Amino acid sequence: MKRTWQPNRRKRAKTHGFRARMRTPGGRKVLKRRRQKGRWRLTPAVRK
Template sequence: MGPTFNPSNLKKKRRFGFRARSKTAGGRKVLSSRRRKGRRRLSH
């Protein structure tokens, strides 16, 4: 079995990026809770 973690910035952005989070209701909830907590970075 090869390495299972093959990092790709494109995949990261598409899956966990700001626009990906904004598309779903759950993702928007994540963003709002992170805003409320005062996170500097909301998403990738």
């Protein structure tokens, strides 16, 4: 049947992407915590 993951590059970048994270107090904290933890990627990668 129709499962729950229906990938969509525009959706992905507009929802979890770098710019959406920056435009918000909580998104900036997300970037801050993932940097402090040393994540290799701070946001999902999408081809664009």
